[PDB]
């Protein structure tokens, strides 16, 4: 029952927990299609190109 | 021959490590907090948020 707090805490925010995770789970990840994108501006590639068009 | 076959047998029983946090009245400090809400305060957020 002591734990049982923790668990009212901890498990409480456990779905709260491992979802915030993998919401920055993909902070990284998605940075190699979500953040390459930027980066496909930032790289000067399109900075750069639409310019050079 | 009753000191500790009956009054420390009985009565410290219950007395030493098992109720100190959640029985703290005759029968119901586990029914109000522990049954009550410690059985229920996940249940009060973990399903709304």
Redesign the interface.
Known sequence: ??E??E???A??????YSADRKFAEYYNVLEQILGVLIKLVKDLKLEHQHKYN | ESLPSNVVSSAQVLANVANL??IRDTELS?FLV?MG???L??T???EK?
């Not at chain 1, 498990?11 to 709260?16: F, G, P």
């Open positions: 029952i002591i049982e707090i668990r009212d805490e498990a409480l925010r456990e779905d709260l | 946090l959640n586990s522990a809400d410690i059985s305060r996940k009060g957020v973990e948020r």
